[PDB]
Design a protein around this ligand. Structure first.
Ligand code: FAD
Ligand code: NAP
Ligand code: FMN
Length: 643
């Protein structure tokens, strides 16, 4: 049932691929690899989520295993794949003696513990007596080489497995794990885009009561945005403040948690995709698993349009592996040839597709000069194109003062193609989707706005009506000290200020209560290092002076602006060296350090910064201080909510 060694044997699998992914990236490649392992060897491969099974019987596995794991927290395994982490990190000496495995670890060198998950996992496996086969792969999203790094590790391991297994090669060739059987009569027992398959007509009374049941990746709660405003005084850039209403359900979130927003690709894009392949969005269809191991991607049956709009991540960078897997369905002989050369030349792919920021469709239109690919099966796509993942946003509202509502401040990703000037702006999906709503919620003449794409605000069967979207809440560790007296140091550049908006709202709804009688019992010094380009992207500028008051002399916000006219750039990490002594004191007083935001280089920087502050302050070596910081990160006094 949920037993590994048992599942593999009963199904006669001769190769087990395991993935421990959080945002589908590892699941994505784990699949590219597993599929290509049947593409050249036709091995019956079981590509499973290291989260659905139980690994007690791991050692009893009779095949060789591929592990695709990503890194989180501080060398942490993706959540809901902790069992695996425990087991592995626990199995004693020679406890996996029979295991033959090879591994690929996705990570981002801009965080400490680069590829820590997989580094650790292979440290234990070793000690557990298992035998690693090829070299240990490290994808580095930091430098944006993930894909090209996978390609490399891939080639290698493919060679190695060829030997170990004495496998004969063959020409590549796609094999569906399902049974694609077109249909005719759209039933209500099927899906038109409903996220989870519980939101099916044949399944809750539209006008019902307080929705229950655990809501999450498997079952998201359709919630309504009850408020939305723009946050930037800018002309180009824009950032949306959204207020979802979760009262209709029993979702109790904490301050510091995250919100997972399930999108639906742009309309201009879903179209560009259906076109190049010459697909009929209406084509109803269904997917039958060819065995208890293959799990159905999404709710089925369904129409092709719904799957391209609600199920398939069509937008985004193109994997060079997807080109190599297309030769089979080339449109014409001249294509099949270029598709090949490209699928083989690291550089040429960059040059002709990657550096130009094409999307699957954009890319293939390019190669064929508009020549349609009526040869690509849908089954192919449903297994060859990544599933759409919800995007996580730091919760900007306080649970204490906004228990029922969830705030989400999300900067819109939407920049000009740096290569093809005449080309459409590189847009993110969930961000603009929120904007289209925000714009439409307020009654703005979108036609006059600079919006880049347009979304089906109605949804499945007007399931998204009243500006709703699928959502759930991820419980995090990002928490404000227990003792309302402990000191607090917050560092959140731009977007990353969100967790501190909560922190303050929260620390205010509190001091408020204590004032309403209970006798306000002190309140530690809270410092917030914010930072943005200028005064047009200054998040919630208007709000801080208000909080500053209710907080007494306990609050203090230091600001830093980078893009400020005639002024030397300045980051929040700079203001730290500026305010070092005060910082150093707050720390010596037990303060808590919170670093949130997008750490392109903000994690290491801010870290290096606090190490500078400490080394200097304690008058010790730079390595010593560094250690000191690591000890805090380990204790929990230095928390990071960076992406
Ligand atoms: C724990 C966590 C917390 C977060 N908290 C916040 C928060 O509080 N606020 C916030 O604003 N964000 C936050 N994020 C980031 C957020 O989840 C998304 O990354 C962001 O909203 C981008 O969403 P999207 O839907 O536009 O992305 P996507 O559509 O996945 O796009 C990502 C980027 O790729 C570009 N792109 C699209 N297609 C291509 C292509 N073919 N080739 C190359 N580039 C392409 C886009 O234009 C965009 O810049 C957080 C992330 C995590 C993991
Ligand atoms: N990257 C992605 O881009 C989007 C924008 O996020 P955001 O609002 O944080 O972007 P942002 O507005 O560029 O970042 C916020 C601020 O931080 C500055 N910055 C850039 N790198 C930094 C670093 N290494 N350390 C400290 N500060 C730094 C920025 O200045 P500059 O003007 O120097 O960039 C800006 O003032 C997100 O979706 C994110 O995932
Ligand atoms: C919140 C967050 C924390 C991360 N922490 C680390 C880290 O400590 N070390 C590392 O090498 N990569 C880290 N990464 C990067 C991921 O390993 C990398 O982007 C990978 O592609 C994620 O794959 P997944 O989406 O399949 O999990 C982090 C990413 C996020 C979003």
């Amino acid at each position: 049932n949920r037993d590994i060694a048992q599942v593999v044997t009963e199904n006669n699998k001769n190769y087990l691929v395991l993935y421990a992914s959080q945002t589908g990236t590892a699941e994505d490649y784990a699949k590219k690899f597993s599929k290509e392992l049947v593409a050249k060897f036709n091995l019956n491969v079981m590509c499973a989520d290291v989260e659905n099974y139980d690994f007690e019987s791991l050692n009893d596995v009779p095949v060789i295993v591929s592990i695709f794991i990503s890194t989180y927290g501080e060398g942490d395994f993706p959540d809901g794949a902790v069992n695996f982490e425990d087991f592995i990190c626990n199995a004693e000496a020679g406890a996996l003696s029979n295991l033959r495995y090879n591994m690929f670890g996705l990570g981002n060198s801009t965080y400490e513990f680069f590829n820590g998950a997989a580094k650790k996992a292979e440290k234990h496996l070793s000690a557990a007596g298992a035998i690693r086969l090829g070299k240990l792969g490290e994808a580095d999203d930091g430098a944006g080489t993930t894909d090209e790094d996978y390609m490399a590790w891939k080639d290698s391991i493919l060679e190695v497995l060829k030997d170990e297994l004495h496998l004969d090669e063959q020409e590549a060739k796609f094999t569906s794990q399902f049974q694609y059987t077109v249909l005719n009569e759209i039933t209500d027992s099927m899906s038109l885009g409903e996220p989870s398959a519980h939101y099916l007509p044949s399944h809750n009374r539209n006008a019902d009561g307080i929705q229950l049941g655990p809501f999450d990746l498997s079952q998201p709660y359709i919630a309504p945005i009850v408020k939305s405003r723009e946050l930037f005084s800018s002309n180009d850039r824009n950032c949306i403040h959204s207020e979802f209403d979760l009262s209709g359900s029993n979702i109790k979130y904490s301050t510091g948690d995250h919100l997972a927003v399930w999108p639906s690709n742009p309309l201009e894009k879903v179209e560009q995709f259906l076109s190049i392949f010459n697909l009929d969005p209406e084509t109803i269809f269904d997917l039958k698993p060819l065995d208890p191991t293959v799990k159905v991607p999404f709710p089925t049956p369904t129409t092709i349009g719904a799957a391209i709009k609600h199920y398939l991540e069509i937008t985004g960078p193109v994997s060079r592996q997807l080109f190599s897997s297309l030769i089979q369905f080339a449109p014409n002989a001249d294509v099949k040839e270029k598709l090949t050369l490209l699928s083989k030349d690291k550089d040429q792919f960059a040059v002709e597709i990657t550096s130009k920021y094409f999307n699957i469709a954009d890319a293939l239109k390019y190669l064929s000069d508009g020549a349609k690919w009526d040869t690509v099966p849908m089954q192919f796509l449903v297994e060859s194109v990544p599933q759409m993942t919800p995007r996580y946003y730091s919760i900007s509202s306080s649970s204490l003062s906004e228990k029922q509502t969830v705030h989400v401040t999300s900067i819109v990703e939407n920049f000009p193609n740096p290569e093809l000037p005449d080309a459409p702006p590189v847009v993110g999906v969930t961000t603009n989707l929120l904007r289209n709503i925000q714009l439409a919620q307020n009654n703005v003449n979108i036609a006059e706005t600079n919006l880049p794409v347009h979304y089906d605000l109605n949804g499945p069967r007007k399931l998204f009506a009243n500006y709703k979207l699928p959502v759930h809440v991820r419980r995090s560790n990002f928490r404000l000290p227990s003792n309302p007296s402990t000191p607090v140091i917050m560092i959140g550049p731009g977007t990353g200020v969100a967790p501190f908006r909560g922190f303050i709202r929260e620390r205010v709804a509190f001091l408020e209560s204590q004032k309403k009688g209970g006798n306000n019992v002190s309140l530690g010094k809270h410092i917030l290092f914010y930072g943005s380009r200028n005064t047009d992207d200054f998040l919630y500028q208007d709000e801080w002076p208000e909080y500053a008051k209710k907080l007494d002399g306990s609050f203090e916000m230091v600001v830093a602006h980078s893009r400020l006219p005639n002024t030397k750039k300045v980051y929040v990490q700079d203001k730290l060296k500026d305010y070092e002594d005060q910082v150093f004191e707050m720390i010596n007083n037990g303060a808590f350090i919170y670093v949130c935001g997008d750490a392109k280089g903000m994690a290491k920087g801010v870290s290096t910064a606090l190490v500078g502050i400490l080394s200097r302050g304690k008058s010790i070596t730079t390595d010593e201080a560094t250690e000191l910081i690591k000890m805090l990160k380990t204790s929990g006094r230095y928390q990071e909510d960076v992406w």
